[PDB]
Amino acid sequence: SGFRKMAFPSGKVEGCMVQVTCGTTTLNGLWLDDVVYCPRHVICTSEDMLNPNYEDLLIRKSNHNFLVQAGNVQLRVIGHSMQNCVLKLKVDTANPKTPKYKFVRIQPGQTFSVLACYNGSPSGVYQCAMRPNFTIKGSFLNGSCGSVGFNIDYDCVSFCYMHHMELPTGVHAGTDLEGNFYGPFVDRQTAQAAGTDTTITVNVLAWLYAAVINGDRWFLNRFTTTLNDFNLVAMKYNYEPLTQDHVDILGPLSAQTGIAVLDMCASLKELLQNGMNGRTILGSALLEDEFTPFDVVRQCSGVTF
Amino acid sequence: SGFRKMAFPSGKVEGCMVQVTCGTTTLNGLWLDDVVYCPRHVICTSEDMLNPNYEDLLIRKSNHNFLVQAGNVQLRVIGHSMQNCVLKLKVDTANPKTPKYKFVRIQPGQTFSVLACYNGSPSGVYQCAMRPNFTIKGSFLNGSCGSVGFNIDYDCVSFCYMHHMELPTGVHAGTDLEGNFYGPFVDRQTAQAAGTDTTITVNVLAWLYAAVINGDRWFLNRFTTTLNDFNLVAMKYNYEPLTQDHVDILGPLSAQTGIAVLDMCASLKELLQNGMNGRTILGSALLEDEFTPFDVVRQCSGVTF
Ligand SMILES: [Cl-]
Ligand SMILES: [Cl-]
Ligand code: NA
Ligand code: NA
Ligand code: NA
Numbered sequence A, B: 001s002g003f004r005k006m007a008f009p010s011g012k013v014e015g016c017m018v019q020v021t022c023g024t025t026t027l028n029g030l031w032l033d034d035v036v037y038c039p040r041h042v043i044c045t046s047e048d049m050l051n052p053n054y055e056d057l058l059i060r061k062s063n064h065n066f067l068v069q070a071g072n073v074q075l076r077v078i079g080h081s082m083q084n085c086v087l088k089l090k091v092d093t094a095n096p097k098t099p100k101y102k103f104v105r106i107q108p109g110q111t112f113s114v115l116a117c118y119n120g121s122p123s124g125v126y127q128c129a130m131r132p133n134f135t136i137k138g139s140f141l142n143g144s145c146g147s148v149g150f151n152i153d154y155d156c157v158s159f160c161y162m163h164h165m166e167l168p169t170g171v172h173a174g175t176d177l178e179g180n181f182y183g184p185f186v187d188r189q190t191a192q193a194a195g196t197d198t199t200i201t202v203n204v205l206a207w208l209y210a211a212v213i214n215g216d217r218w219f220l221n222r223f224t225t226t227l228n229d230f231n232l233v234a235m236k237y238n239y240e241p242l243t244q245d246h247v248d249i250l251g252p253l254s255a256q257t258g259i260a261v262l263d264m265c266a267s268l269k270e271l272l273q274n275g276m277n278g279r280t281i282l283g284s285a286l287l288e289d290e291f292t293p294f295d296v297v298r299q300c301s302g303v304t305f
Helices: A054-059 A201-213 A227-236 A244-249 A251-257 A261-274 A293-299 B054-059 B201-213 B227-236 B244-249 B251-257 B261-274 B293-299
Strands: A017-022 A025-032 A035-039 A066-070 A073-075 A077-083 A086-091 A100-103 A111-118 A121-129 A148-153 A156-166 A172-175 B017-022 B025-032 B035-039 B066-070 B073-075 B077-083 B086-091 B100-103 B111-118 B121-129 B148-153 B156-166 B172-175
Touching: A017 A035, A017 A121, A025 A066, A035 A156, A054 A077, A066 A077, A066 A086, A111 A156, A201 A244, A201 A251, A201 A261, A201 A293, A227 A261, A244 A251, A251 A261, A251 A293, B017 B035, B017 B121, B025 B066, B035 B156, B054 B077, B066 B077, B066 B086, B111 B156, B201 B244, B201 B251, B201 B261, B201 B293, B227 B261, B244 B251, B251 B261, B251 B293
Parallel strands: A100 A156, B100 B156
Antiparallel strands: A017 A025, A017 A066, A025 A035, A035 A086, A066 A073, A077 A086, A111 A121, A111 A148, A148 A156, A156 A172, B017 B025, B017 B066, B025 B035, B035 B086, B066 B073, B077 B086, B111 B121, B111 B148, B148 B156, B156 B172
């Protein structure tokens, strides 16, 4: 029993973190086989960062401009290129700790683990969701650029996120490992604003199901509403609309607890309209929206309490 | 910026998790050099577990009763013994991935990372505090026994916790790596109750400081109270008393934000008396007490916003 924000074990990713230095700029890189991936703005000085032309800046560099360190051992660069906003450095040694891996791009509302790194050295691990406005609410200080987010599926690491920058609101933006930004952001030091965020409804429902699985029941009721009637209260409280395909993935949770999805939606409606009246759910005093249906299944028991 | 529940990277501990099987019982073990550590109740059958004499049960076993698996590779046991509630299995191979490590026992209120494991295979990582009643609010299903909790200090792993069991309230109990239980618990299948828990005051203050460091300020005020006057409101709301030594470790946080400890205590007093009036702090709608002063410093910027 119990429910925690739970990250994937980070060892397979720790074996891949290196430090990339170009001039006076230093950040983290991801070393898979004989390629290091890092944010391309490692090639920018302080002035370049304001309005950079990256094709120009890269053409003025050669392999010797790039210092790659895996611990103390230095990797010599034998090639470089640009793929959108990530830099690729070909090195002369294939990372022998390279796990099975894929580059995947995730959807708003999905979660992943973040290995925060500084100077090529892992310092912490945590769980994150991709917000509906394509930012993440991470924990990153200067020098964390190049930290990656990932999911693990049977010793295969699916890399979904590379960290590039913090926005004015303190939230974080980056790319997939092909260098394509999540959301309407660009890698230059200008003030950029995310769109307005919304609450991930299917995740809140999944987390209510985790509550029931763990014995928290006070918020339930006998009422039921219809799909379209709920979606009206959603829009009022700035929640995502619920789809019949979202209901379907919530299916296994519905079956295991015996509580139909639309039944649980009525309880959510009531929680939105009346608040919690001082009580808590799974140790929280607000509705949590960063656990997916998959996250609930994998952490919770297979049998309801 | 940002503030997250953050675990230590788990790789150094992942290299040490093995599966121990004795008869039909299977749980996780910790392999350091040529010794495997696991909970001693791996030697109990279902009936033995009700009222076990472990000295009897162990004397009736030999090295061949114990199956140790590190992945597929099997380790052959060349000796066994008991140290309080942990079993020690001498194996014929020193773990080549053995990190620098120590066995340390932590205090109520301190935090550590937990590597949850099933059948010798790491499945998740999270942060935990030792509660003042010597339980932890973990996330553990059947087969997680033998999972360890740890802190990392410059590539030295300080192991502080081995998981043994879940109590009736759903909280979790275990030992240090010498096999001495945290709290008044014993390793047998009888209903055991923790004492009443209390809120870790110094941690809540540390987390309020993290709020200020990150720009959350609405809860502050100009008031100040005295140490002894605060401790009276503490006892009313079931909070730990504040010591002058707790103030001192909060010193660095006090200095960096410019907010004296007793100043912050007044804001806490007001938060206790009036609640949050609907607002949140660091993304939470209750007062969080599982971040230590050290956890705040290590994750937060060195300069206030
Ligand atoms: Cl290349
Ligand atoms: Cl031994
Ligand atoms: Na975590
Ligand atoms: Na209902
Ligand atoms: Na004050």
